[PDB]
Amino acid sequence: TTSASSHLNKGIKQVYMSLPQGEKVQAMYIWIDGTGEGLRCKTRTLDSEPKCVEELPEWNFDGSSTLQSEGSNSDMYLVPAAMFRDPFRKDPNKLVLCEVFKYNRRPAETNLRHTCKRIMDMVSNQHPWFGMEQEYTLMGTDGHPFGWPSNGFPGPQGPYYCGVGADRAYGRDIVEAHYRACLYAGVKIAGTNAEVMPAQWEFQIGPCEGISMGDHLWVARFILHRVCEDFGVIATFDPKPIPGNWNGAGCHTNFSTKAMREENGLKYIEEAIEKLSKRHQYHIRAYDPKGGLDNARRLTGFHETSNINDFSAGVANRSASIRIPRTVGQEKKGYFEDRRPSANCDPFSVTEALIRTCLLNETGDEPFQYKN
Amino acid sequence: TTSASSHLNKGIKQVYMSLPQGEKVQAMYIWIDGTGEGLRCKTRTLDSEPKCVEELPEWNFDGSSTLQSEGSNSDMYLVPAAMFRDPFRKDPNKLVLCEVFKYNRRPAETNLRHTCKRIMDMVSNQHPWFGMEQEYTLMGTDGHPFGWPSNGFPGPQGPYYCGVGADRAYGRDIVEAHYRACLYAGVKIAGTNAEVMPAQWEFQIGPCEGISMGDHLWVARFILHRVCEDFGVIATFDPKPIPGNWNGAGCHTNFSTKAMREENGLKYIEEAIEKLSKRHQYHIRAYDPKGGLDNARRLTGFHETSNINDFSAGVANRSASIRIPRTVGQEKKGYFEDRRPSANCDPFSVTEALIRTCLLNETGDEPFQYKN
Amino acid sequence: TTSASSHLNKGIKQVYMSLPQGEKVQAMYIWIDGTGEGLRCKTRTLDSEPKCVEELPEWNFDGSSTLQSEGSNSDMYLVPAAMFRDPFRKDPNKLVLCEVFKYNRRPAETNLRHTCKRIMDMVSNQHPWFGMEQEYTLMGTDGHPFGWPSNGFPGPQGPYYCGVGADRAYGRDIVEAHYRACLYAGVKIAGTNAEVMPAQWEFQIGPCEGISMGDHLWVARFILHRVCEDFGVIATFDPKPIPGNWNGAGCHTNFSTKAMREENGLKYIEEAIEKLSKRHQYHIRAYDPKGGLDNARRLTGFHETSNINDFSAGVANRSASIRIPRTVGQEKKGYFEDRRPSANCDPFSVTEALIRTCLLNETGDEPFQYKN
Amino acid sequence: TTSASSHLNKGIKQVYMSLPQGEKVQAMYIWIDGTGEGLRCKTRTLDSEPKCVEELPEWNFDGSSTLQSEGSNSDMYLVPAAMFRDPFRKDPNKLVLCEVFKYNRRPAETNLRHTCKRIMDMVSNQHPWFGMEQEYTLMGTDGHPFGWPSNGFPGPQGPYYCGVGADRAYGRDIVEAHYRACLYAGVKIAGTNAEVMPAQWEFQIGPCEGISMGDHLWVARFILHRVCEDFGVIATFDPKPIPGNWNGAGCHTNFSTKAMREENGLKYIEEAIEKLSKRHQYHIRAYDPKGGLDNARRLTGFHETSNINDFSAGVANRSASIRIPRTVGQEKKGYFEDRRPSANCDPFSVTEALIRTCLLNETGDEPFQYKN
Amino acid sequence: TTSASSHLNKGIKQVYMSLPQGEKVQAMYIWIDGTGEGLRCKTRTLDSEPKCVEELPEWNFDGSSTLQSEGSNSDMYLVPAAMFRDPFRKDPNKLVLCEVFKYNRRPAETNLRHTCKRIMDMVSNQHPWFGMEQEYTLMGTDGHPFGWPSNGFPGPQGPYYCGVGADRAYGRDIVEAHYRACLYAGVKIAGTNAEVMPAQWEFQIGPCEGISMGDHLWVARFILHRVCEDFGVIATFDPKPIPGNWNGAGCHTNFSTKAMREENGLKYIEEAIEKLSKRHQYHIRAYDPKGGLDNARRLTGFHETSNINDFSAGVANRSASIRIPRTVGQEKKGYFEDRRPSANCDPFSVTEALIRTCLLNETGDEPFQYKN
Ligand SMILES: Nc1ncnc2c1ncn2[C@@H]1O[C@H](COP(=O)(O)OP(=O)(O)O)[C@@H](O)[C@H]1O
Ligand SMILES: Nc1ncnc2c1ncn2[C@@H]1O[C@H](COP(=O)(O)OP(=O)(O)O)[C@@H](O)[C@H]1O
Ligand SMILES: Nc1ncnc2c1ncn2[C@@H]1O[C@H](COP(=O)(O)OP(=O)(O)O)[C@@H](O)[C@H]1O
Ligand SMILES: Nc1ncnc2c1ncn2[C@@H]1O[C@H](COP(=O)(O)OP(=O)(O)O)[C@@H](O)[C@H]1O
Ligand SMILES: Nc1ncnc2c1ncn2[C@@H]1O[C@H](COP(=O)(O)OP(=O)(O)O)[C@@H](O)[C@H]1O
Ligand SMILES: [Mg+2]
Ligand SMILES: [Mg+2]
Ligand SMILES: [Mg+2]
Ligand SMILES: [Mg+2]
Ligand SMILES: [Mg+2]
Ligand SMILES: [Mg+2]
Ligand SMILES: [Mg+2]
Ligand SMILES: [Mg+2]
Ligand SMILES: [Mg+2]
Ligand SMILES: [Mg+2]
């Protein structure tokens, strides 16, 4: 059910961690791996506490161990990009998110922040905002959802959405610890709730400005993985973890600009939606690390989902693939929600695709190569 | 016996919860389900601590999954009504109880605090007071009462009422934690005691004036469910959890007015009882969430219970439909107790029916006209 | 072996008990039930901290559940008698001992404090002092002594009296916790030691004047029951728990008066012993809740016990019915010990009979009825 | 879970049963108790092997222990009615089914065979034939269906009907043993199959003539109970053991006479159905051991059942109350089926009601007192 | 629950017991110890198979180990009295029941067959017949009844008497094995049934003539003990093993003579009843191994038992001290039943007392010496 490491005595760990540290500081480097969905990390000591992200050194790792290079020139580079406070070691320790490069100082295949930042630099004038809702399922060490009957199923759906009670919610300790850890670290977490099927949860981040959204999301999921490791369970972002009559997991994203946020933005929202209506296949390709075969499992037209190759829009409709909140419609200003993306999406890719389609008016099936 | 969640290590949870929070504040929203006897909740972050229930925003939820709407017009509203301190995440965090309205901004089917408040407003002058006694049973995850022998029974009744000892009281930790948490939160809890069958307990709320009774009781129920979830057991309000020669569970209500309290209260008490004597079927219908089917299994005439179809009153008689305390009878002032309502009743409905029948001098088998 | 409640996580309980209370305070009422040996309790909240036992209101309970009345007029009365401060909830909470009356406002059958206090205050001038040694057996939830081999026995007696090893003493945690709890509450506890048979212990209380003996002993018994409930074991006062070649349980009593305790008090000690020599059957009947059937199984002339119906006395003779300490004999001052009472005796009855026979002068098979 | 008795070593019992018997013989008596749905048994020793049911003597039992009489005149009589070979002890030992009589020689309250025999005798010319389909569910000692996940459910329905494999058929050994034992005993068992709900099964008895149908069915039930006791599981005939979206249990009955079995009997079948369509309420009341409240939980129009308050007929319609097999319809002769009776019905009552309504042309609400 | 020796592999033993024996024969001796209710046994080898009990030789044992002598003159004699076939080792091995004498060749204290034989020889001409019903309870090694919930109780009484099913009959395999072993051995066993309390059973021995009754009953007790040892459980004959609202155990006895058996024996039956009605205390003293202390705990007036201090008679009344079967009453010949003796009685004493009081017209509280 749970891993062997979770059966050790944690009082010993607390006793050891209670010791005073001294004068030197710990820093943890984190980066994306070659599969486009994993994460890796390492630790090193520093002589004094940094005050900003740009006053700490670069590093390197062995690329042949993460299938990002060959043995002859396995060396790769790590360049810091953003830093936060460390909730597992407390102040003055830090967490560092880095960018990958090849031995010739060129971005790696799975490095998309490089282009996303350049794209954001152009529209900084109107400075949009993003907010995403991440869903996940807690799994045991034997390949079954945590807390489910051994080789069986719980009752039918209907009582588990936003439920309270020992027979209606599984694993709230993880959620509470994750919430507090994100708040302490400095990730702007906005809320949480339980999902339709048991052992399924959700948390939301934002609104975030420009490039910071992807960094915030990535650090949040790193923290989730670390906490789950502490408790001895597994967190998975698979879009369809359990086949059959059980809901899937998505990553709905909310978007707005200054024009929409101002008075009478509904017309701008409408024009943006009409622009989006003509790039369905391009966006579907963008929203998946494997081109869309993963999202093919989830999007089937039922269980509060729309069809893979059908575009629609509406107000208060949760199966339209794009919806306007009723309050937003009534007030004639706000944002709109896109609910095609999958749970294992890449925030940089999704955000860049949306920005390109909406603000730069470009069309086709291949992104415009370069802009000044 | 106990849930899998209860077998995780709680020291980790404690160390995570001991971190400083910062400047943000957490708030939990609670509302009543579409079946009339369930609860749901979810959380959000706020920029600063509120100091009144009128200075925090509204929200919404998906009604399709709570059995109160359909997909096309699923969205529903939430309007805060009362506020308390959060005992699970201490200050400055809060918890909020709210009402439910549908898309056209009309009260939902299961919302009755609206009318209850509207009528308490017009009855205000008499300053009515209420007090209620809630009973419940503790159950394991396998469907048997907590602590009972596996596929068996404990000894016969008689030594379990207000008992002390490892062989006479089951699950006192839950009770102690629940009472302390209620006091911290600010609910008007008045006491507790053990009941006739083992693993059965009770707590009392009040006295409180007017509309506050319902929200106090509902918040106490939510706190109990949360504490039981933390410990890994289930709390049920079923009127007849175990068939046979075992006691049921009820919700005795106490009623009073300023005239009955100041002096010569028996004169008003007797006439109120007389007026209540001729609305038996109406009150029985009001006291149940499903028209009275559930209560039929409890009220049978024995086990210190009155019959369903018979009305009675007396002094110090615990087998009647209405009881008058001996001290009240002696001192000529006080209150009287109604023993018909079942353990899974709705306080809003109960108090509304009581006020209508007693103080408004109404009659008939139908709810009265819109106003009074 | 141990109860199911003992297998819950107590860190959660401590965390919930680690919250501030506020302005309101809790009081726990305790009284003796209709069997003459059981205890019951209830809790209620007060607006402010009481300063003396005279500030507490009276209360009531349902006598049909406790086997002391009928459902028609089950209601009884509770009137506080003594007050201590609660060691399970810390300051400013309290626990209060009460005596029971019938609905006529007269004492109940098992209420003996009423006459005991009246007799005590009639000889108060003499300043009588009492001390009692209470012993008990720790039992598992399956009906066997705690820590004993499953269905087996430990070695023969001889090494367990005041043993100091893991193979010589069973359950010292309970003993230490009980000692500290009594000291914090304010009971007049004087010492403890392990007994001849494994898993058997004893504690001493006194000396205290007049009517305080019964109150102190009863409150100590309640505290022991609560602590054992916390740890998940059972404490029993049965005079002969294990049949065969194993020691029994008794409650020796020490008695003193101002006349004695002075220079050459041995004269009065011997005079009182001779006076007591005449009422053996009366004292034997008094010393047992059920007239002496229980004490028959213990008093058999073996294991340092005297015969049931044979009176004897001597200095430093532990096999006699009455014993005088050797130091008392050497100094010619002090007290004498009565070894007849059984472990489940009633202090009020025992002390009243002792004073009747020693300070007052009474004879015959019945007590003097006209208040003396 | 399974019973404690099932964990003993059965090789010892086999070794003991291998002993040669001798010249004495054993006989087991079986009868119905006061609840109307229970069986009891006991054993006697005989001097020689009987050749027919006429050679066995009468006996008696204490009726105060089966709630069938009072303690003053508790004696009741047993009169043998049918005989079979014993499959648990093998030849020459016997099984005997008996009728119950009162101390004054009047039939007991739950003795319907007495009237059924006369009713069947008065219509011996037609040579009626009957056939019943008994459905049942296997349960563990913990109260859940055998083989189901602990506190959980198996997959949705559809693959279990007439299933084969370790994951779609639970407990086939019991079915095999029961079939073989019935064949050895001499009961007319026609077939068996697995049912829609996992752990649910069915077996068919018939065709039998006249009064023998009830005897065969009762003996079959007894043998099933004994086999399940040997294996350590429980067999329940409750119409609706699991609430929700799961199948119930019925006791469909097949009926025909010589005229119907002859050529062009479809006319007789149709007129019988016609005259049967008038006494729906009477037949519903007769088809229940308690009166019909039990069958109300199964007949609701769902999962291949007709509504309790409506009467309907058809050829291939399995949702109607009466059905006519397609083969019968094509060939113009045969039998017809009744699908109303519940799983825990009494065959004597069912057959008596069918005969009275169809062949004796009775009408009204109360049975004709004498003769028909 | 079950003993360690019952967890061994029994196939090995079964393999070993299949070896051909040879020309030697084993014989096991059985005798009653000094407590008056315990059995002992041992085995020896014989050269040839004996044909009658007179061919077996004498033997001896060490009485110091059975508390029947002292260490100096410890030797005691054994004299064969009856012979049976061995069911545990099969033919041609034997069982032998013996009498006990001390070193000077006269009966020991607990040897009553010596006197019973002479008393029976005195009245041989009347051909008395006896029959007894033995009740017993099965227990685990932990001290609780076999199959009972761990530290709990099953449902209330009512369904267990003569029950069938996994949930209402505990340990039928032992009953079956004991029945078959007795039949093979040659004991006159007449039947068996399940009793009111779960795990309680009964078997009937008779009708035996004269002195053979005690021999048959003792051998049956021994066989039951050996079978239970094989299965790993304990059989206890205590009259009241479980205090409370649970049935006790008795050893009812049935008696007749040739005159009673012949026509119009009712006069002799009632004559004997009236003759017995005036020696209640003497018979109560004789019907116990310790003067009647044990039986006092069973006879209390309820649970179909008569009061210890009263004598009664009637027809078909199971609450009286004596009873005449309704069949006997309807006819004018038969037998009568005495329900006073306890489960742990001695058949020799019971039969001797009945004969002396009913056929020798003895009087007083002492037995007449020598012949009558
Ligand atoms: N003006 C805005 N621009 C972008 N995102 C916004 C804006 N206002 C709110 N959001 C985001 O919308 C999200 C709301 O998600 P959620 O409450 O789960 O909506 P729903 O449950 O109705 O899909 C929040 O994460 C928030 O950050
Ligand atoms: N004047 C009053 N008006 C209304 N309710 C009152 C008044 N005084 C006391 N009560 C209520 O009466 C209740 C007493 O309940 P409880 O003591 O459990 O009743 P019982 O003694 O029948 O068990 C308390 O919850 C309290 O709030
Ligand atoms: N003057 C006195 N009057 C009454 N009791 C006394 C007096 N002096 C001591 N005692 C009591 O005698 C009790 C028994 O002492 P204890 O240590 O048990 O000695 P022992 O075990 O040898 O009997 C103590 O609890 C003490 O309070
Ligand atoms: N001529 C007949 N008269 C009465 N009953 C019959 C006749 N022929 C067959 N039956 C009965 O019909 C039943 C058919 O059982 P089954 O095939 O399970 O029914 P279904 O086809 O509805 O599942 C058998 O139990 C059999 O005894
Ligand atoms: N003629 C008789 N003389 C003596 N004993 C008899 C006679 N007939 C039957 N019995 C005895 O009756 C006993 C059976 O009684 P039982 O069936 O237990 O009756 P119940 O259970 O109603 O008390 C047998 O042990 C048998 O020895
Ligand atoms: Mg959301
Ligand atoms: Mg959304
Ligand atoms: Mg109350
Ligand atoms: Mg009350
Ligand atoms: Mg001492
Ligand atoms: Mg002492
Ligand atoms: Mg069928
Ligand atoms: Mg059919
Ligand atoms: Mg019998
Ligand atoms: Mg009998």
Side-chain angles (χ1 to χ4, degrees), chain D residues 3-5 8-13 15-21 24-26 28 31 33 38-46 59-67 71-77 88-90 93 103 141 222 225-226 228-230 232-234, chain E residues 2 6 8-10 14 85 87-88 90 146-147 158-174 176-181 183-184 188-194 196 204 226-227 230-231 233 304 315-319 323 325-327 330:
Chain D
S3 74
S5 301
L8 298 165
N9 193 303
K10 309 292 180 166
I12 312 321
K13 192 199 173 179
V15 166
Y16 277 108
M17 302 315 276
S18 294
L19 285 165
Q21 187 164 321
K24 265 76 158 70
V25 181
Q26 298 165 281
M28 193 186 242
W31 71 94
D33 69 8
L39 294 159
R40 317 266 177 152
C41 65
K42 61 202 291 193
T43 303
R44 284 72 136 80
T45 300
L46 302 178
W59 250 91
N60 57 277
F61 69 94
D62 163 35
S64 176
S65 301
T66 72
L67 46 82
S72 302
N73 268 301
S74 67
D75 268 3
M76 315 277 252
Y77 299 111
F88 313 101
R89 300 163 174 163
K90 302 164 100 310
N93 313 286
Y103 74 92
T141 40
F222 172 83
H225 278 309
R226 264 296 268 111
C228 286
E229 185 188 295
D230 269 357
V233 291
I234 293 155
Chain E
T2 57
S6 78
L8 298 171
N9 194 312
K10 307 295 194 182
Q14 178 51 23
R85 296 162 85 205
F88 314 103
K90 306 172 99 311
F146 177 75
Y160 307 103
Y161 170 78
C162 289
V164 65
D167 55 349
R168 54 216 292 259
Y170 303 168
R172 197 192 289 280
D173 322 82
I174 299 110
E176 297 284 316
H178 174 260
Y179 207 137
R180 188 62 74 97
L183 277 178
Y184 178 92
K188 283 197 78 173
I189 179 158
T192 64
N193 74 271
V196 169
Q204 292 102 239
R226 266 295 272 111
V227 165
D230 269 3
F231 273 104
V233 290
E304 278 59 75
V315 169
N317 181 5
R318 290 173 196 273
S319 62
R323 188 180 83 108
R326 171 151 261 139
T327 325
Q330 289 297 116

Side-chain angles (χ1 to χ4, degrees), chain B residues 5-22 24-65:
Chain B
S5 287
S6 71
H7 293 142
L8 306 169
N9 202 295
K10 307 295 177 160
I12 299 160
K13 165 78 177 304
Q14 180 52 23
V15 314
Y16 276 108
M17 291 307 281
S18 87
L19 288 168
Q21 216 182 296
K24 328 298 289 195
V25 173
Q26 293 167 102
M28 199 173 218
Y29 285 49
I30 302 145
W31 72 90
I32 289 160
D33 199 12
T35 66
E37 55 186 310
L39 292 164
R40 323 266 192 159
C41 60
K42 57 177 182 174
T43 309
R44 75 187 286 171
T45 44
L46 312 171
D47 290 311
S48 55
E49 182 184 25
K51 338 287 287 212
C52 188
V53 70
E54 270 76 25
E55 63 181 39
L56 75 186
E58 315 182 341
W59 210 2
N60 55 285
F61 73 97
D62 174 13
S64 290
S65 36

Side-chain angles (χ1 to χ4, degrees), chain C residues 218 258 305 367:
Chain C
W218 278 117
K258 181 48 149 30
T305 69

Side-chain angles (χ1 to χ4, degrees), chain B residues 4 50 64 69 75 77 92 98 125 130 171 199 224 264 271 284 294 304 313 315 331 365:
Chain B
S64 290
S69 73
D75 76 302
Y77 286 111
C98 47
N125 276 302
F130 298 94
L224 179 64
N264 172 342
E271 61 179 34
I284 289 282
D294 272 325
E304 67 161 46
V315 167
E331 295 194 354
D365 274 51

Side-chain angles (χ1 to χ4, degrees), chain B residues 10 14 87-88 146 158-159 161-162 164-168 170-173 176-177 179-180 183-184 189-193 227 230-231 304 316 318 326 330, chain C residues 5 8-10 12-13 15-17 19-21 26 39-45 62 65-66 71-75 77 89 103 105 222 226 229 233-234:
Chain B
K10 307 295 177 160
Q14 180 52 23
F88 314 105
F146 180 69
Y161 175 80
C162 292
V164 60
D167 52 331
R168 262 133 56 87
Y170 303 164
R172 178 168 256 126
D173 288 329
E176 297 284 330
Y179 203 145
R180 176 61 69 97
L183 274 177
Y184 180 84
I189 183 151
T192 65
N193 72 278
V227 169
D230 249 343
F231 269 103
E304 67 161 46
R318 284 185 177 256
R326 195 180 287 276
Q330 259 163 41
Chain C
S5 293
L8 304 170
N9 204 312
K10 309 300 195 178
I12 304 297
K13 165 79 177 306
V15 159
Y16 275 107
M17 283 9 236
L19 284 137
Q21 213 173 311
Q26 303 142 29
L39 293 156
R40 318 256 168 159
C41 59
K42 280 206 294 181
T43 302
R44 76 189 282 170
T45 70
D62 164 36
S65 302
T66 77
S72 59
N73 282 287
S74 39
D75 49 317
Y77 290 102
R89 293 155 174 173
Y103 83 94
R105 200 66 53 82
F222 176 80
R226 258 297 267 129
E229 187 189 308
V233 293
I234 293 159

Side-chain angles (χ1 to χ4, degrees), chain A residues 55-87:
Chain A
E55 63 182 33
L56 59 103
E58 64 175 35
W59 212 4
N60 54 276
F61 69 95
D62 167 34
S64 71
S65 296
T66 76
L67 64 78
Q68 274 170 296
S69 150
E70 81 294 352
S72 315
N73 296 280
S74 42
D75 50 305
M76 323 266 307
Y77 286 104
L78 293 163
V79 48
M83 105 186 177
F84 300 87
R85 297 166 78 201
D86 190 328

